[PDB]
Each structure stands twice: as structure tokens, then as C-alpha cells.
Design a protein around this nucleic acid. Structure first.
Ligand SMILES: [Mg+2]
Length: 577
DNA sequence: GCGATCACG
DNA sequence: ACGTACGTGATCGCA
């Protein structure tokens, strides 16, 4: 039972409560709050938001850091409230982040899924209540109120068991000192948004519609026929049946036309280079011009991403609607998209700071590999040094092709090395790749010992860990299926590296936000892209940021090798290079 | 809805 | 003998 309240009472404002501030729309930016539930020592309450959020005592309670709240996905509530000019403080327990740290593979995305981890089933999945996709809707008040009170009651009854298990895992500080403070910082970043130069985007797309038409007509002429270049089935028929190009592959999905296949097919027909170019331009038009403009707010011309903090299996963030972690940079034609990402105020600039080789520096630290540690203590070009070691040549004798192949070896080492995977990447034989790998481990025997030991540890304990005690369970490590077991072995090798790098930049974000506040700088974090942080600030703060941001990022943790941070700034994101 | 594809670190 | 590089999200075509 619970109270369907018509007005806020003092009983509802106790100094510890489970709080539900329900936002049903997936994108919570400027979205409605459909209902509120409070569970505390005095009872269970459902409040209508138009009543509660207009009540000064309830708003003061929400903003009082000394009034502690337990929630699920507090960032969603905090951001929805920010759009209403209401501050949420005092969130001491977030069940979504607790569940994520205990086991990221559960895919916990609602209270019911977290509750099932502790045999609590007296709450419905959100999808059962609201529906999926187009059939989605807020139910009538009796159904909605019971659901919100059941979620608040579940949070109330799950905080202790979840904290107990986090404690046993030595993850309690990871929740309270890393993920929960980070959630508030991410909320600020998403709410600030990034300003988009939409007229430049519209022009850029224009440059693109003309070039697409040009290459599309060239492809039709070369194919001797007009067809749907973007259809995988149709392209494969044109290439491999009409034009009779060679098929170097498997499976029975018609034919693969991925860029790695087309790059090998290019010497056989002029059409292949044009299809690759058409693919590049069409990706920019559909995803990064048209798709971006769809989610720009028409009034402010800002995009407000949502950073999913409880999704990836390694501890990284992800970014949605739009994804601001995969904006084009590698080819110049795509890189120009970043000219459309601009500071949100006049006379401000974009400032970008990135870790240099954080994953291999983490590997040097965790493996305690003498040669790799010394390479970073000398601040060597790690791919040139790896080439020197594996091909047994002096620095002057490293050719560009040697550095390229050594770089691919380094990628494989971080991903979880295999002769098959390296051979596929470098387009060489498994035996040739195995020789590269053997040479690598002769030069980096500590890395070899580390990789052997971490796979054995994953088998023994059932999971692997990161520097700050994030965990990933790997039950497939004991599979008698070669493919299944090999997947788990690569995850055992990769997750402590990628995940520790994620831990470090998350701590850097917390440290940076604190330093920006101490210095009373106007600079603000806008984005994180795995190993880099993107800020905007007044032009008059650039000199201070050039010293502050790299130092904070470099000092976030202390490893057996230095951390190194590069930085750039300019008038647009493109120019911060 | 799902696989293929390609964008990023 | 075995055959996938690690981690993500958006779009498209097609069933
Ligand atoms: Mg970098």
C-alpha cells in the first residue's frame, strides 16, 4: 500500500529516501517527468510532478545534499530536472551503477532487472508497463503510481544487499568515489550540449550531394547499368556476377562487399575505387550531415548526447543520439565535419586533450615489462621501437612498411593476440603472423608472461579486473569450443587494458572538474572520447588550460611509466588539432 | 527486427 | 585443429 498524495508533507522530506523521478521518453533531454515516488521510514508516496515540482519545500529537499536519496539512473532524473531549472543533490546510491559494477553482462537497464539479481521480483519491467516502440505510452495514474512505488520500494530494499556485495568485491569506492561523482559530471556535460554550425553543415552536405551524383553516374557508366549502389545484394551481383570480379571469401550471404574486400579488388576494375568513394561520401551524408541535423535542437542549435555509463563490458562510456564519439577524423573529407562543431559563446574556443598511447602504457604498467616500460620512460615512438625490436634493425633501418606492421602487432597485443587475427589484419599467412608474434614476445617477455597469467587468472577466479577494481566475468574461458574459448581469452587479455584506461580517464574527469571549480574557470567539459577530453572555454582561459588540463590528466593515477597528454585548441573542433 | 557496413578510440 | 582481431552506435536494405 501507498499514499497517493495531493500535496507534499513533511513526512515525505526525510533525510533518507528511495526516490523515483520518472522520465519515460528514452531521450530525457527536456522531456516530461510523468510521476514521482518517495519511499522512506515514514511510508510510501506517489506525487504528481506538477504538484511536487512547484512546491518549494520539495524542491529544496531535492537540492539538499544532506538529504540522501537512493535512485536508479539518477543521471536521467538529474538532467530532466536541470531542464526544469531544478537541482538534484544528495544521491548517495544509484542502483543502475551498482548493478553495472557487480556484473556488466547482466545488461541491467531497469529496476526489475537489477532486482532479479537478488531474487526480488515484486516489480515489473519498464517495457511491460510502458510498451515498446510505437505502442509505447504512459499508463493511467493507478497503473503508473503502483509501478513507480514498486520501483522505489525495490530500490529501498536492494540498497543494502548491493552495497554488501560491492564491499565484498572491493568495489564500494569505485561506486561512491568514481562512478557516482562521474554521473553528475556527465549530466552537466550532456545538459550543456555542443553548438552546431548548421548552415556550414547544410553547405557541406551540399558539397556532398553534388559529388555523390558525380560518382554515382560514374559507377553506372562503369557498370554498364543503373542500379542501387547502396544495396549489398545488388552491388555483390554487379561486382561478382556481371563484372566477374574475383571472390576471395566465405559464408552464404551472397557476397561480402566490405572495404577490406574492395581494397583487394581495386586492381581488377575502375569501379571498385568509385564504390569505395561513394561509400565514404554516402556515410558522411546519411549519418553525419542528415542524421546530425535531425537531432540538433532547432532553437539553440545544440546537440545533447546521452552518455550511457552502464552499457559497455569494459567500463567505457558510449554516446547516443547523436553519437559524439565517432565523428569523422581519419580521412580529410570526413574530418571537415568537425568544422561544424563550434563553441557555444562568442570569443570562446574548443580545447582538446588526449592521452598518448594510454593502452600500451597501461600494459607496460600491469605487465611490468622491462623493455616496454623503458620505451615509455624514454618517450619513444612505440611503433618504431616495436619494429626495431621485432625486425632486429636500428632506428635508421625501420622502413614505413615495417613501422606499419609493428603497429598492427601492437594493436593485436592490446586486442588479444592470435596468429589468425593478425594474419587477417595484415593480409598475410598464419605462419608469417605467428613469426611476428614470437618475435614480439622475445622482445617483450613480460608482456608474454602477463598474457599467459591473465588467461590463467580468468580461469581460476572466473573474472578479470581493472586498475580501479572493475570486473568482467568470463565463463566462456573454460569452453571446449575453440571459437568460444578464444573469444574469452582475447577478452581476458583486452579488458584489463581497455578498462583500466577507462578508469584513468574517468578519474581524470572528476579531478579536472574539481580543479576547474577551484580555479573558478568558466571552461567546461563537453565530451569524452575514450582517451580524450573536449572542453570549451573563453579565449582568455586557453593559456591556463594548456597547463592545467594535461597536468590533471597526467596525474590522475600514478603508474610505473609516465602518462603523457597532448593538447590543441582552435575556433572549431576541426581546428583543435 | 537484423545483418552488413563503416564511423570512432 | 582451429579461425576472430578489442569496445561501441547509426544507417541502410531487406525480410
Ligand atoms: Mg590519442
Amino acid at each position: 500500500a501507498f499514499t497517493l498524495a495531493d500535496r507534499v508533507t513533511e513526512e515525505m522530506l526525510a533525510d533518507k529516501a528511495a526516490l523515483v523521478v520518472e522520465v519515460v521518453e528514452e531521450n530525457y533531454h527536456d522531456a516530461p517527468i510523468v510521476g514521482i515516488a518517495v519511499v522512506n521510514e515514514h511510508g510510501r508516496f506517489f506525487l504528481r510532478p506538477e504538484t511536487a515540482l512547484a512546491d518549494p519545500q520539495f524542491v529544496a529537499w531535492l537540492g539538499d545534499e544532506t538529504k540522501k536519496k537512493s535512485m536508479f539512473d539518477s543521471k536521467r532524473a538529474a538532467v530532466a530536472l536541470k531542464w526544469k531549472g531544478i537541482e538534484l543533490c544528495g544521491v548517495s546510491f544509484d542502483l543502475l551503477l551498482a548493478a553495472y559494477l557487480l556484473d556488466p553482462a547482466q545488461g541491467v537497464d531497469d529496476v526489475a532487472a537489477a532486482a532479479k539479481m537478488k531474487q526480488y521480483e515484486a516489480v515489473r519491467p519498464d517495457e511491460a508497463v510502458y510498451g515498446k516502440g510505437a505502442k509505447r505510452a504512459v499508463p493511467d495514474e493507478p497503473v503508473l503510481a503502483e509501478h513507480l512505488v514498486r520501483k522505489a520500494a525495490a530500490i529501498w530494499a536492494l540498497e543494502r544487499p548491493f552495497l554488501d556485495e560491492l564491499r565484498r568485491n572491493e568495489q564500494d569506492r569505485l561506486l561512491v568515489e568514481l562512478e557516482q561523482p562521474l554521473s553528475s559530471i556527465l549530466a552537466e556535460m550532456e545538459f550543456a550540449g555542443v553548438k552546431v554550425d548548421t548552415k556550414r553543415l547544410e553547405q557541406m552536405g551540399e558539397e556532398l550531394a553534388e559529388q555523390l551524383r558525380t560518382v554515382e553516374q560514374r559507377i553506372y557508366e562503369l557498370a554498364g547499368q543503373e542500379f542501387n549502389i547502396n544495396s549489398p545484394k545488388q552491388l555483390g551481383v554487379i561486382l561478382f556476377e556481371k563484372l566477374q570480379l574475383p571472390v576471395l571469401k566465405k559464408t552464404k550471404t551472397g557476397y561480402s562487399t566490405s572495404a577490406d574486400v574492395l581494397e583487394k579488388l581495386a586492381p581488377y576494375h575502375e569501379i571498385v575505387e568509385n564504390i569505395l568513394h561513394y561509400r565514404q561520401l554516402g556515410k558522411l551524408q546519411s549519418t553525419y550531415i542528415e542524421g546530425l541535423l535531425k537531432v540538433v535542437r532547432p532553437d539553440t542549435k545544440k546537440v545533447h548526447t546521452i552518455f550511457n555509463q552502464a552499457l559497455t563490458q569494459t567500463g567505457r562510456l558510449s554516446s547516443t543520439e547523436p553519437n559524439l564519439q565517432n565523428i569523422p577524423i581519419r580521412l580529410e573529407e570526413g574530418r571537415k565535419i568537425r568544422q561544424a562543431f563550434v563553441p557555444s559563446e562568442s570569443d570562446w574556443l574548443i580545447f582538446a586533450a588526449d592521452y598518448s598511447q594510454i593502452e600500451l602504457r597501461v600494459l607496460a604498467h600491469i605487465a611490468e615489462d622491462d623493455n616496454l616500460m623503458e620505451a615509455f620512460r624514454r618517450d619513444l615512438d612505440i611503433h618504431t621501437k616495436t619494429a626495431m625490436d621485432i625486425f632486429q634493425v636500428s632506428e635508421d633501418e625501420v622502413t614505413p612498411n615495417m613501422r606499419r606492421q609493428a603497429k598492427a602487432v601492437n594493436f593485436g597485443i592490446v586486442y588479444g593476440i592470435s596468429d589468425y587475427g593478425l594474419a587477417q589484419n595484415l593480409n598475410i599467412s598464419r605462419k608469417e603472423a605467428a613469426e611476428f608474434i614470437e618475435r614480439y614476445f622475445e622482445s617483450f617477455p613480460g608482456v608474454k608472461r602477463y598474457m599467459e597469467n591473465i588467461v590463467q587468472e580468468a580461469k581460476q577466479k572466473g573474472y578479470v579486473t581493472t586498475l580501479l577494481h572493475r570486473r568482467r566475468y568470463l565463463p566462456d574461458i573454460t569452453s571446449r569450443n575453440f571459437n568460444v574459448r578464444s573469444f574469452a581469452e582475447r577478452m581476458a587479455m583486452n579488458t584489463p587494458i581497455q578498462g583500466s584506461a577507462a578508469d584513468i580517464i574517468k578519474k581524470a574527469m572528476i579531478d579536472l572538474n574539481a580543479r576547474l571549480k577551484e580555479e573558478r574557470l568558466q571552461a567546461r567539459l563537453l565530451l569524452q572520447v575514450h582517451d580524450e577530453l573536449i572542453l570549451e572555454a573563453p579565449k582568455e582561459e586557453m593559456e591556463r588550460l594548456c597547463r592545467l588540463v594535461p597536468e590533471v590528466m597526467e596525474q590522475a593515477v600514478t603508474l610505473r611509466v609516465p602518462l603523457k597528454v597532448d593538447y590543441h585548441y582552435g575556433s572549431t573542433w576541426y581546428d583543435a588539432k
